[PDB]
Every structure is written in C-alpha cells, then in structure tokens.
C-alpha cells in the first residue's frame, strides 16, 4: 500500500510530485527500492582511480592511480609502487641490500634462500629481483 514501494533501484520516491517515482539524477544512484533520496556517486581522485563506473543502481569503486597499489580492505588507501629489486622505505624506493631480493612491485626485501642450511646446492645465483634457486645434491 506504500506508494514508495513501487519505486525500484535507480529511482527515488517523492509524493509531492505527479510522478511518484523519479529517476535518480546523473552521478547519483539507489541500490535498493523505496528510497526517497539518491546516493551520490563517490569520487576516485588524488591517488585513486575509478575502477568500476557508478550506474543508476550501484556505486563507483576506486582502485589506485597507476604507480600505486591498494592497501587495506576494499582498497582503503594507496601505497606507492617501486621497481622490482627495490623496497619502499621511509626514504623512498631503495635498492635491496646484497643478499636480499624483492620480486614484486610492493613489499619488503627478503633474504636469499640459504641452500646450504637446507642441504641443497645453488643452481642459480641470487639477484635483487630473484631468489636463489636451489637444487638437489
């Protein structure tokens, strides 16, 4: 019996009008029916980038601008990338120390796998980008 129940997602209800259900204005949406206001599409600016465009029935989602990667749940914040073989410290991206490596454009350097301590031999030496490849005997 509620006249606003006839207004589905993508529209909003306002009984002061001839047409009870009105489309949500551009850059706004409603993810459920019966709303009497439209949610404004969220912004992806600064370090953020619009991953999924907002529609009349769904909000926009933000990933990070190129050169940055997501951190936290739902890409809450962004963190600057570094090249492979580097590490983001308090003094910027720095090359890994000799004996460590980083194979990703994020994270910290990690020590090379010590093949001797595991009873194996070195098949391929280590690199700032790549871990040591161990081999049997």
């Amino acid at each position: 019996q509620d006249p606003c129940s006839n207004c589905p997602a993508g529209t909003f209800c306002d009984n002061n009008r001839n047409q009870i259900c009105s489309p949500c204005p551009p850059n706004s949406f409603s993810s459920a029916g019966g709303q009497r206001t439209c949610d404004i599409c969220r912004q992806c600016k600064g370090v953020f980038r619009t991953r999924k465009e907002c529609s009349s029935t769904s909000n926009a989602e933000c990933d990070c601008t190129p050169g940055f990667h997501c951190l936290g749940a739902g890409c809450s914040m962004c963190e600057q990338d570094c090249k492979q073989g580097q590490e983001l410290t308090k003094k910027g991206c720095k090359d890994c120390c000799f004996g460590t490596f980083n194979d990703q454009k994020r994270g910290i350097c990690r020590p090379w796998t010590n093949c001797s301590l595991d009873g194996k031999s070195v098949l391929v030496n280590g690199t700032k980008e790549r871990d040591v490849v161990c081999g049997p005997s």
Epitope: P25, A32, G34, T37, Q43
Partner: antibody, heavy 117, light 108 residues
Framework: QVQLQESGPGLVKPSETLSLTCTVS????????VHWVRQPPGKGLEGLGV???????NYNSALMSRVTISKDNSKSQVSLKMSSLTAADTAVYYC???????????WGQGTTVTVSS | DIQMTQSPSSLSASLGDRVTISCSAS??????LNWYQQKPDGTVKLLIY???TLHSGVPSRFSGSGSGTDYTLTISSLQPEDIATYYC?????????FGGGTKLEIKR
C-alpha cells in the same frame, strides 16, 4: 511522527575522541540520508558529512579525515565520531534528514559539545 | 569549495515590510540552492528548496527566486515570528556549503 534528536557527551577533554548519536523517529535510514552540521559559537552552519541510505559516506575535506560517520539501520541511529579535537571543535552539533535531490527537510534540535580539560 | 555569500550580514525591517535577502555563489550552481531559517533558540527548519519550491507547512509569504550565481529569499509581509537567522545552502557540488546567514531583527 518524524523527529530527529542528537545525543552524546557535552564535555570532552583534549584526549580527543568525540562520539555523538542521532536518533530518527519517522524516517527509515535505508530510505533517507543523514547529514551532520555544526555551528561554532557566534558562527554559521558548517556541514561535516553525510551517510547515504546505501551506507556510503562523504566527508568535508577541511575536517582532515578526522570525522567518521556510521549507522545501524535496525536501531534507527546514526553515529558521529571525531578525533584530534581542538577547542575549535566546540560547537552545537545538528543532524538533518536528507530528502529528495537534495535538501535537509528535518533538523534535530542540536547538542552542545565543549572541548576543554 | 563553492563560496556562498549573503548580503547583508544583518538587517532590521519594519513589520509588514517586504524583506529581501541576497545569496551569491562563487560559481554557477544551476538553481541548486536551499533556504533555511534558524530561530533564536537554535531551531532550524527548511523554508524553500530548489530555489523556489516552498516546503510543506511554510507560510505562503516566503518565496525564492534567482538563477546562475545570484539568488534571493523574499518575505512579502514581515511578521513578528520571522525574527531569525536565514541561511542559504548550495548542493551543486560536494561538500555542500552554507552561506554566512543574514540576521533579521524587527523595528517597532
């Protein structure tokens, strides 16, 4: 009938977490937005943020991301949290109902917050 | 943010006078402006939305007009209960910003 009422502590020291509550009477939060506004003494109305029926929020940049707004639809409550309070955050805080696209058609009476040791 | 300025900051008018308060935006807001009334005890209510649409229950002596960057709120016949501060509010761009408000007092 439709009514909004703010609530929360009136005195907060500069160990700086402020928490307020906006209770709505005749307006479902899944159908309406809720906007927080504050008026410093001898000043005008200053909006703080809005939480939409879908749960997403938008905040004023001047608040330096110290303001967080959440809600519980089943309890008909909208929560306002603010950190890093200065004496500049002393004001009376309003919550208003966002209707149409867009206007504040229902206002609460306001709650006074004083930041002092 | 969009800057909202109201002229004058304070006004005193006789009863039955026609009152007009101005509200100007730093940029065009495409008639996305609301008017609010704050009574001296702190009560705030909506007067007009979309710059000319009277909210339900507001007396018919309130009216708004304007376009572009310049908008006004008109009281056709000033009444004793109209003693209040009046704020304009734009919703063209987030964050929504209020004007500085015009304080209205009544001569007698």
């Amino acid at each position: 009938q439709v009514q909004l009422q703010e609530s929360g502590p009136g005195l907060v020291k500069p160990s700086e977490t402020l928490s307020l509550t906006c209770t709505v009477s005749g307006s479902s939060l899944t159908s309406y937005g809720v906007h927080w506004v504050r008026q410093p003494p001898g000043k005008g109305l200053e909006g703080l943020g809005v939480i939409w029926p879908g749960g997403s929020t938008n905040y004023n940049s001047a608040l330096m991301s110290r303001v967080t707004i959440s809600k519980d639809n089943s309890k008909s409550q909208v929560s306002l949290k603010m950190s890093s309070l200065t004496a500049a955050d002393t004001a009376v805080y309003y919550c208003a109902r966002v209707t149409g696209t867009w206007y504040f058609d229902v206002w609460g009476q306001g709650t006074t917050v004083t930041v002092s040791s | 943010d969009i800057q909202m300025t109201q002229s004058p900051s304070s006004l005193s008018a006789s009863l039955g006078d026609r009152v007009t308060i101005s509200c100007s935006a730093s940029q065009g807001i495409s008639n996305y402006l609301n008017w609010y009334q704050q009574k001296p005890d702190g009560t705030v209510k909506l007067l007009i939305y979309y710059t000319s649409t009277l909210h339900s229950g507001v007396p018919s002596r309130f009216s708004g007009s304007g376009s572009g960057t310049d908008y006004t709120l008109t009281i056709s016949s000033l009444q004793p209960e109209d003693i209040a501060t009046y704020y304009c509010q734009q919703y063209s761009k987030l964050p929504w910003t209020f004007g500085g408000g015009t304080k209205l007092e009544i001569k007698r």
